[PDB]
DNA sequence: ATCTGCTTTGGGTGGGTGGGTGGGTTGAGGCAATT
DNA sequence: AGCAGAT
């Protein structure tokens, strides 16, 4: 088992957490977090953000 | 290493310290409450008041159970008692009252794992300073408390850097002076935490010197038993650092003897005392006077001479409206109402500078005083520069005056380089540096207050003003108000001035009694309030000022037809007039700029020069 | 490692018994075969 | 694994056949160019 | 005193 030195947080859990974040995430979550939900559109906010960012980077 | 028998036993002193901490009261015990706050992560600095120790000692004596003199022992040798007190606190730290996230802390997890490893090994630690989260300081023995209990307080008695001699080393003393240099805060290492790439253990090393030699080979029991050679490596995440800062304290002018030069002394600040000293402050630093031994070869070469410094432990820092303000600006001179009014207008410097079209009209009123030697130019400059919060006094510094009035004395003498610098400042309000070593550009929206003498040393009526002034005509034009003060002999005025100066010399106070000058603090706060405000102007006032401008331009052209005129009016004069009106309105505290303010500004510009030239 | 040599990532691997060994390197931070290879090579 | 031996800081108790692109930085005095 | 080398 891999653990960061001096802490009690697993590296595997971190990797899976960030992978889940990247494969599935939308700007609408950010908008609701900042209390800007009423500005949510129907196309850009509902489309995966970082997946598009990875595709364009490739 | 022979031995002596000193009349001090540290066991009774340690017992006394513990009793003082657990029992003293001045609610519950004061120091126990402070320790409770320290445990809950609220507090990170414990200050021991020697006054409290004296009070506790005298209370014990009154009860009849006389004990050892703790305060004198602390004062005579203070380095040891820091560690003694820290140990006493470590022994009696109360349990926390508020739950905290232990797992978040790196050290808690590391020490838990160390405990687990030790338990496993047994089934088949770390220095005390590592876990400390507080700093201990000594507050000196106050003079009043020492006098109350019939004792002498060496610690709180102030000393100059000269009086701090070589026999004071190792004591708790106080120094008086002004700080001349403070270094940046930086991390000083107390305990170093290593790691073993093979054994999986951690080592700790204590550092109490300017230098140290890092460990390179594992010393863990497992490594030695197995003989495995595991290299030790540093880890900054687990080490313990204390904020460090080095300052310098210099003698005051009044403390240096006759025909001598001032001396300076180093100061070390650690823990939560950092950032409590800045250059220019006059302070009473209390600290422990210690040497700074050299190391290695330098120690061998240096001989027996030793550097010294002070471990800071406690720092004590030392401390009709128009007419009234004008007369109160400088009561020790003979009244110059117009000049004082203009200087107050300069001080407030009201302006609405929001053109936003690419650049804006200058937002500072500049004043120039030019007069034959004998009139109070330097005194006016000194007073107007002390009153202002940003005033900077120089002789023919600008950075310090940014967004403030600049006090330039002997303006005429100044060198061409500084003349070009000010010319740049007025036009662009910017400080530009173009050097290979550094390239930094700073804005400078600062006002200038200049004092100069005519070309020949005195004003010559035969020659016109322009010829009398050495400075370029453009520079004079750029000034918002140019004041020409002359010294005309006269029986009555001379008698009044002589009586004033002579009364001041005999009694050391203002002679005038018809009116009472306003307190400087009230004037300063009112000036700041006025600076905070923002007036406005209408269209009718705009038309009035426009009409005044055409009248002034016609009159100035007619005057320029002759050689007597200082200089024909220009749009700069219009901008100056409106600037003065805005400042006057700011003084009035009213948005709407009254015609009265414009009229007063016009009168001020007229009397700036014509009033005395026509004489 | 993508980052430079002085980035400074530290590891704690858990043995089948409750003891923790220390390894250095991002590759170790990600992988276990690399961690064991480094453990062997550092001897 | 133990015994033998050189060299610092920075500074004139190493020097100018090591120099100043290896650091020790103000003060005075002479010279060309600028005036 | 720390480190560089020969027995
Ligand atoms: N109206 C006055 N009342 C009292 N003292 C005055 C007055 N005018 C001038 N003095 C005195 O004149 C002395 C010289 O003045 P100050 O040094 O301020 O200016 P100055 O001599 O014109 O300047 P400079 O140094 O440029 O020649 C000061 O001691 C000041 O006290
Ligand atoms: Mg003067
Ligand atoms: Zn080890």
CSV table of N, CA and C in Angstrom, one decimal, chain B residues 113 117 120 195-200 235, chain C residues 10 17-22 39 42-43:
chain,number,residue,atom,x,y,z
B,113,UNK,N,3.6,6.9,14.5
B,113,UNK,CA,4.2,5.7,13.8
B,113,UNK,C,5.5,5.4,14.6
B,117,UNK,N,6.4,1.7,16.0
B,117,UNK,CA,7.6,0.9,15.7
B,117,UNK,C,8.3,0.6,17.0
B,120,UNK,N,6.5,-2.4,18.5
B,120,UNK,CA,6.8,-3.6,17.8
B,120,UNK,C,8.2,-4.1,18.2
B,195,UNK,N,15.7,11.0,7.3
B,195,UNK,CA,15.0,9.7,7.0
B,195,UNK,C,16.0,8.7,6.4
B,196,UNK,N,15.7,7.5,6.7
B,196,UNK,CA,16.6,6.4,6.2
B,196,UNK,C,15.9,5.7,5.0
B,197,UNK,N,16.6,5.6,3.9
B,197,UNK,CA,16.0,5.0,2.7
B,197,UNK,C,16.0,3.5,2.8
B,198,UNK,N,16.7,2.9,3.7
B,198,UNK,CA,16.6,1.4,4.0
B,198,UNK,C,15.9,1.0,5.2
B,199,UNK,N,16.2,1.6,6.4
B,199,UNK,CA,15.6,1.1,7.6
B,199,UNK,C,14.2,1.6,7.7
B,200,UNK,N,13.8,2.7,7.1
B,200,UNK,CA,12.5,3.3,7.3
B,200,UNK,C,12.3,4.1,8.5
B,235,UNK,N,14.9,16.4,5.5
B,235,UNK,CA,13.5,16.5,5.1
B,235,UNK,C,13.0,17.8,5.8
C,10,UNK,N,8.1,12.5,-1.5
C,10,UNK,CA,8.5,11.4,-0.6
C,10,UNK,C,7.4,10.4,-0.5
C,17,UNK,N,3.7,-6.7,7.1
C,17,UNK,CA,3.6,-6.3,8.5
C,17,UNK,C,3.6,-4.8,8.6
C,18,UNK,N,3.1,-4.3,9.7
C,18,UNK,CA,2.9,-2.9,9.9
C,18,UNK,C,4.2,-2.1,10.1
C,19,UNK,N,5.0,-2.0,9.0
C,19,UNK,CA,6.2,-1.2,9.0
C,19,UNK,C,6.2,-0.4,7.7
C,20,UNK,N,6.7,0.8,7.8
C,20,UNK,CA,6.7,1.7,6.6
C,20,UNK,C,8.1,2.0,6.2
C,21,UNK,N,8.4,1.8,4.9
C,21,UNK,CA,9.7,2.1,4.3
C,21,UNK,C,9.5,3.4,3.5
C,22,UNK,N,10.6,4.1,3.3
C,22,UNK,CA,10.6,5.4,2.6
C,22,UNK,C,11.3,5.3,1.3
C,39,UNK,N,14.3,0.1,-4.3
C,39,UNK,CA,14.7,-0.4,-3.0
C,39,UNK,C,15.9,-1.4,-3.2
C,42,UNK,N,19.1,0.7,-4.4
C,42,UNK,CA,19.7,1.6,-3.4
C,42,UNK,C,20.6,0.9,-2.4
C,43,UNK,N,20.6,-0.4,-2.4
C,43,UNK,CA,21.5,-1.1,-1.5
C,43,UNK,C,23.0,-0.9,-1.8
